[PDB]
Design a protein around this nucleic acid. Sequence first.
RNA 1: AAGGGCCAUCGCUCAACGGAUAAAAGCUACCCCGGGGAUAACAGGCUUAUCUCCCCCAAGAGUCCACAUCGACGGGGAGGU
RNA 2: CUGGGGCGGUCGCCUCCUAAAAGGUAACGGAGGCGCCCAAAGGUUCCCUCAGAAUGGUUGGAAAUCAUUCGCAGAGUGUAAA
RNA 3: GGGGCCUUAGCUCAGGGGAGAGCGCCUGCUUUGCACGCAGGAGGCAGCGGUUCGAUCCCGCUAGGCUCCACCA
Lengths: 135, 536, 83
Amino acid sequence: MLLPKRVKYRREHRGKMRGRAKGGTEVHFGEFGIQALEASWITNRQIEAARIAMTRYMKRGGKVWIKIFPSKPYTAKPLEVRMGSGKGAPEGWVAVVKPGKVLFEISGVSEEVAREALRLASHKLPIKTKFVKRE
Amino acid sequence: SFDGMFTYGMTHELNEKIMGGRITKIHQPYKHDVIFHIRAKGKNQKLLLSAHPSYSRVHITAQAYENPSEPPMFCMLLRKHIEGGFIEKIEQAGLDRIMIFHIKSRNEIGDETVRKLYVEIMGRHSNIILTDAAENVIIDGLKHLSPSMNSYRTVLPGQDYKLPPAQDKISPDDILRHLSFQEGRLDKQIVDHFSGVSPLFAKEAVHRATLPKALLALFAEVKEHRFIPNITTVNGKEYFYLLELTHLKGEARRFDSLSELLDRFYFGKAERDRVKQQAQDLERFVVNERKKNANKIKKLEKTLEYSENAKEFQLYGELLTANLYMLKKGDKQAEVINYESPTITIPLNPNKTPSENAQAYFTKYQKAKNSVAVVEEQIRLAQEEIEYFDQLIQQLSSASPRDISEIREELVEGKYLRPHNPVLETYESTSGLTILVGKNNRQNEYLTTRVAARDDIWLHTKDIPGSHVVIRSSEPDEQTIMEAATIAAYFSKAKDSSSVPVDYTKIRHVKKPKPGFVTYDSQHTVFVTPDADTVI
Amino acid sequence: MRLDKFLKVSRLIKRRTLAKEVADQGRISINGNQAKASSDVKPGDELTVRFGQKLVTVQVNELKDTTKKEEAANMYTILKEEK
RNA sequence: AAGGGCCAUCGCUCAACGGAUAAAAGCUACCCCGGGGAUAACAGGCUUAUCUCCCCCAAGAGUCCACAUCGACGGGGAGGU
RNA sequence: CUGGGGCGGUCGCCUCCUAAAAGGUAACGGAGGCGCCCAAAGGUUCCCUCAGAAUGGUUGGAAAUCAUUCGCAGAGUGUAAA
RNA sequence: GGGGCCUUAGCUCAGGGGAGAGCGCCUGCUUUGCACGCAGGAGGCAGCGGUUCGAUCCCGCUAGGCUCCACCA
């Protein structure tokens, strides 16, 4: 459950996930990676689920290199409450994702193993994905 | 110790020096303790006073201990009315444990004035008071005492001073007159006739066996200042008095000055007893833990005696796998032979197959095996801890404060407790050699590892628990080999045990495997015994 | 302040409980008047007290609450004792 | 002359800060009038966070065996009680 | 005022974001400040340039002050922010 | 859940410039003396963050506790 240690503002606007990514569109730390085909917010619980999934499938395998970090916080008012009276309290932390963006990489491991692990992770994630490799 | 006799001796023997002593400086180092640097007889001298209840006394010390950074209220009040004083006279207060200084000094206008400083040393309720000469009014007081104690006298300033009720005791045959010697335990009731008495003095005089002679002779002795200031030590419990020891087995060390006697007594006892309190408070806790671990393993052992059906199930599974062809699925029993050719009737589950049943027996064997392994590991843990604490208590018995300070940190590191090169201690040895040791486990390990080589020799117990000690590259003669055995037997699980074998082994085989779980090989062993301080 | 608090801080009596007890017995008084633990006091007050037969008369100079030990007795002065 | 005017200046958390008076708190279930669906309680409606139900990946439990039956961390939907 | 009212909270002024590249722009939207201070902390003339880092060096110490080269600026700008 | 108060040694307390006053329980010492003591159990700002050369002392966020409120259909 990743966390930014320190932040300026505990409360931010949400934002808009228009367009494609700026960077991180291609694997370069590792060999076999995964990228997105949509745009969405992703949570520390999602990423750690995917991470531990692939690492359990691999059991010693090489290196991973996540390519993101949930910097963004997201609020949520308490339950059964009218509107207004200030912005809701923070709940967790979020990473924002554009399409064309690489999320997880892999090295030290064969292609079939990598593809299967990333499949497993994709099923923990909400969005549509693609298997990718380095050029 | 501090009887009216000792008091009266001091009264004359300090007026010997401090006729008209010019009080040059005043300080209050500790709570119930006050220092005067006085100039009398053309010389500067120290004068300690103490109303500290058990240690309340008066003294003159070569050790000007420490003048404080803070001048307290009482000190400054003394500075107000006594500073630059002049000790006209000393008085004994009629042989009670009380003293008087008749003092002169000029006031703030240069007009000469006088005062009466009183020092009542009663024991738990001693005190120091300052009083006016003519008015007898108290001006200062160290232990203000309000009459909620509904007592005769009172301390507070301004009030007319008053002395305690002097008891109806003839302060100096008269006991054979007044007291019925049939009463017995008369060491008690000499206090009931005389003023300056200790039960120590009374007992030592009563043990002279009708003995008025002893009383009269000793009174003449004191009156003549014929005493001998020594300190007595009856197996510890170090006592002292004007007279020497009379009968008891205790050691004696004599002095030229009662003041030096007081110095060499109290200079240690100020903190020795504190260290003893700390040591005992810690020892209680350690013994609680060790006793707890012992009872813990007792629980585990007496619990272990009720789940031990492993081998039966093992052998049953063996036999069933051996006889897995004569057996129906649905049967209750099996007359079966062991591979000594007995014939065992093993029960079955009439629903299961023999395969299932035998596998269940193997399963139960596995389970009992597992649980027993668990309990045996817990046993090993607890016994390691118990032996650790037993060695620890041995060390604490044979300890010094310098190693106790390390042991505390060792245990706080072990997290049983909560809140840098000096390692070893040595003395003389045979062949003019030096043999180093450490009563602390940590210091002992530091010496064994970092202070010697592998080919050197370590000498320790050939037995359960003792210290660890050796000379730097211990390769000296058999004289030193046998001398190390004495140092080993001295600091051991059983000090003064005249049958203790010591193990001497090359440091190259010293096993550095809890802490101080050091095994040893390349070892020989020699029966030996404890010794005296000549082991130093 | 209150009498019992005053007695404790001045260390005449070691326990406020005991101060209350004696005031409820009425063994003591103020300015010739019988008093109680809640009785108000001030500087200049003249206080009569009993300890069995020991009767006492004192005078109030000051009053506070932090009252360290030796500074307690500065708070007041003895005047007289009877029995 | 009193007094007033002009000029300069002082006096207000008048703070509810364009300040209603120099001067002011509450109960009403004993209540009343004028109006409102411009605004609340029921129901209806939109939403479906929540709720219920279904499903995906599948580690793991299941002696062995993921999917007999259960199903973690996570994910996606339906319904409109 | 009020996402019914009540209770809570707020009520004037300043700075930023929201604010959509002039300006302006709401919400019980997000962050913070004011109800002053200086008689020199003003005016003018003249002067010079910071913070930190590395070296060496008593007390001096990780950290005073010291010389020392590096050093658009990481400092300062009475106070909050721009 | 909201608001206010509090959260400093074992207990009770004071105190933006360096946390210190008193008291008690258990143990030990202790002794001639009308409960008159001493040492150790031990003496540590609920936590997090920020401003300042500095924070218990100013600010903010959160936890624990006490009190008040949590009403109309």
